[PDB]
Amino acid sequence: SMNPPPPETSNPNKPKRQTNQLQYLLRVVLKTLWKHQFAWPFQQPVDAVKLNLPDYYKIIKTPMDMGTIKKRLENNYYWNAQECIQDFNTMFTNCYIYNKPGDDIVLMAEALEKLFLQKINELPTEE
Ligand SMILES: CCc1c(C(=O)NC)[nH]c(C)c1C(C)=O
């Protein structure tokens, strides 16, 4: 029932890269989702205590959110685009795994994910 440590956003010994695909993921992909009217539930880690979801972290062992992804991009956590893409995908998957089909949060994740898929479809080729 208590909240876990948030996902890591800083790790100095992890090697880093700033690539055009990763720049696209911040400038285009993250910006689009972050400003969306349904972004708010996904803008920070699930606070299981305040939301009263004591089994959330019992079920979800790989939590992820756009707040975390935003810091990871802004502070250059990643080596490649696929890591960041996997984080976005994990965030959506967590939602569908934990919640019931047709809950509001699932509709929200579905709208965000649709946009995410359209942008990732136009991911530039690596420079
Ligand atoms: C419905 C509770 C919830 C929020 C939220 O309401 N955040 C403020 N965000 C997420 C990802 C969820 C779940 C359980 O998937």
From Swiss-Prot:
Q: Where is this site: Acetylated histone binding?
A: N99
Q: How is it modified after translation?
A: Phosphorylation by CK2 disrupt the intramolecular binding between the bromo domain 2 and the NPS region and promotes binding between the NPS and the BID regions, leading to activate the protein and promote binding to acetylated histones. In absence of phosphorylation, BRD4 does not localize to p53/TP53 target gene promoters, phosphorylation promoting recruitment to p53/TP53 target promoters.
Q: Altering D104G: what's the impact?
A: Found in a patient with a neurodevelopmental syndrome; uncertain significance
Reading the lineage from the top rank, the first entry is Eukaryota
Cellular compartment(s): Nucleus; Chromosome
Cross-link (Glycyl lysine isopeptide (Lys-Gly) (interchain with G-Cter in SUMO2)) at residue(s)? K58
What family name appears in the similarity comment?
Answer: Belongs to the BET family.
Q: What is known of its domains?
A: The NET domain mediates interaction with a number of chromatin proteins involved in transcription regulation (NSD3, JMJD6, CHD4, GLTSCR1 and ATAD5). The C-terminal (CTD) region mediates interaction and recruitment of CDK9 and CCNT1 subunits of the P-TEFb complex. It is also required for maintenance of higher-order chromatin structure.
Q: What does this protein do?
A: Chromatin reader protein that recognizes and binds acetylated histones and plays a key role in transmission of epigenetic memory across cell divisions and transcription regulation. Remains associated with acetylated chromatin throughout the entire cell cycle and provides epigenetic memory for postmitotic G1 gene transcription by preserving acetylated chromatin status and maintaining high-order chromatin structure. During interphase, plays a key role in regulating the transcription of signal-inducible genes by associating with the P-TEFb complex and recruiting it to promoters.
Its protein name is: Bromodomain-containing protein 4
Organism of this sequence: Homo sapiens
> From which lineage does this chain's organism come?
Eukaryota, Metazoa, Chordata, Craniata, Vertebrata
Q: Which residues of the full protein are shown?
A: 44 to 168 of 1362
